[model samples]
Target: GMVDYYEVLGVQRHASPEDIKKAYRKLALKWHPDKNPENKEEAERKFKQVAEAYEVLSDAKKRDIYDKYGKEGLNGGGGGGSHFDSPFEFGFTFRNPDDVFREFFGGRDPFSFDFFEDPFEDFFGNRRGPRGGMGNFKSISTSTKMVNGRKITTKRIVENGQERVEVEEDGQLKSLTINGKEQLLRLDNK
Candidate 1:
């Protein structure tokens, strides 16, 4: 069983499209993956959930079926009891969160975090050449894009005496932070 869309959006079962839209706007901004560097896993979960909820609730026709059948009903709406008939069959599916967000925003990208100098150069102790080398540097910036239906976020932060680059997707995070020489020494020891 899946979580209810209305519950995900914090809206009434009978909420109007405009009301759903309003709710989505608030949740979308608050839970956007880039906005929660320290809690990106939770943010991405909520962000994707919110986008899925909005996509279903915002469409009057979709809403009708969803209201009556929920996700189970949707899975079978395409003349079968399961999506196994064809991987490409039309059925209710979770669209990429970034895609949903972009559509809602009229295709305007609104999550461009300013890029900064590469921080990995200092950690690695030299700016190594391009690919084909073992050195890959990370810089200061935040980007959100869809890759094969995955909303991936790569963010670099250098602030509050901490510097790090975090790569996030589907509740997983990969990162290393340099708090100072002491922190560097600890990581260097590894």
Candidate 2:
């Protein structure tokens, strides 16, 4: 019998769109070929499975049909077989390349990470910030002093810190301390 698309992705019948997306992402990452280069056969199998799951879930009409009748509905009385047909045999079929990329790379580059620095900035908002300059140099600090002995300093850190520091000070100071440290912090503050 054809495998249930929802079951293939380990999602429930009532899974939301985000839930479906997340499930596909999880499965695709696990089976992507780039991440499992040593197991080509396994990776290929998983890629097909993830592709099949996404194909149905991403389409509103198809998802409705599949949800109600399972894989059997999708096959339309075809004998027990794989839900995914060979792409070579059905070249006319429309498949999302994002799903394929996710299967191949084990993750998505929504920001066009492969091609652009931050493609999502337009849709999500501006992400433009100072990027550390090239070479061994790092943070460049700028400072300005007002007429009333008020001083303001702006520090820009780049590349996590492997370069020189440029400090601009307006008033004379006896001593200045610049501390730099790198720590691997846990994901959760707890």
Candidate 3:
């Protein structure tokens, strides 16, 4: 019998996307062939297992299918073939670049502005001086629970050179501003 996908990923059936990603990263790093060449056979087996688990959990449609019908739903007839195909093979594809990047980079974007304020900062000198600037950086992240059971999140950043600010909202807005920067000005939502 096949291993339980949730057990393979070390996550509960109701695990969040973040939880699934974290578990995969931890397992992948531990079983990476390069890190454990003496156990190459075991490592390779685990790598494939983790990859398969990620393929299903990382996608909404595949996850829904797995949740509703279990692993058998993944297989057309569920007997001879393997259940470890890429999620794309089953018509589940990520529509966002962030999702793809997260999968490759192991949970978060390595090149995100949050990690490196400026790629050339080390060579060109830091933009923030000894005292640093008084301006601030603001990030607006909004999540809406749709009637279709999908969650939609929109994020934007406004930097003023000082502290970082975070915001969240759900409904439409007339005017949205951050760090003295206007995102929408006198806009009609109707």
Candidate 4:
């Protein structure tokens, strides 16, 4: 409860609203409950602190109120403002844990991590030339076999430090053990 709202969001007392929002989003992701469920008790505690900080500093009036009163001026009356709302009721819900996610990914596909953001570039206004073609490269392993002969042979091979996989490819499979663990090196046409 004693963590300052500005300190909670890691912002200066005179920070702009956008700067405050950005800081809140960054710290929210770091202290989110899902990020540390095993230590949920402490996670919930910290998450509440982050939420409280955002709640106060993000609002100009409340920021002024808390800044002047130091948590005393707001609730010292028969008040009806947000200061009366309990801060610990940080129930994680769709909108609660979803803003940071929505900002990260577009409103569709909540389960996708493939669209990682490049912070320095937004694909430069979502426009880019065609990607360069892959340069010539030698295959780690190449083997040919007849597919009509379903009973094919398989062998583990490591070429150029690249391990082979178990799945059938090039009509045959050269599976390789990597770091004492089996891995497939299939070049699938599917």
Model 1 ranges with Cα > 4 A deviation: 1-3, 67-89, 106-190
The per-prediction tally of clashing pairs is 0, 0, 5, 3
lDDT (CA) per prediction: 0.61, 0.53, 0.55, 0.51
Per-residue C-alpha lDDT of model 1 across residues 1-190, encoded as one tens digit per residue = 3327778988767677788888888888678654565799888898888888888657666645553444445454453333232223276655787888888763222433224323233454322223212334444588889889987988766543346656678656644444532223234444
Provide the RMSD of all predictions against the true structure, rounded to 1 decimal. 15.5, 15.0, 18.4, 13.1
**Candidate with the larger TM-score of 1 and 3:** 1
Clash pairs for candidate 2: none
> Which number leads on TM-score?
1
Residue 33, candidate 2: how far off, in angstroms? 0.8
Task: Give the clash total for candidate 4.
Answer: 3
**Which lDDT value does model 3 have at 73?**
53
The alpha-carbon lDDT assigned to residue 86 of candidate 3 equals 38
- TM-score for each prediction? 0.44, 0.39, 0.38, 0.35
Model 3 scores worst on lDDT over the 10 consecutive residues at 125-134
Model 4 ranges with Cα > 4 A deviation: 1-3, 64-190
Quote the RMSD, in angstroms, for model 3.
Answer: 18.4
- Among all windows of ten consecutive residues in candidate 1, which has the lowest summed lDDT? 125-134
* Tens-digit lDDT track of model 4 for 28-65: 65665555668889766666676556665566665555
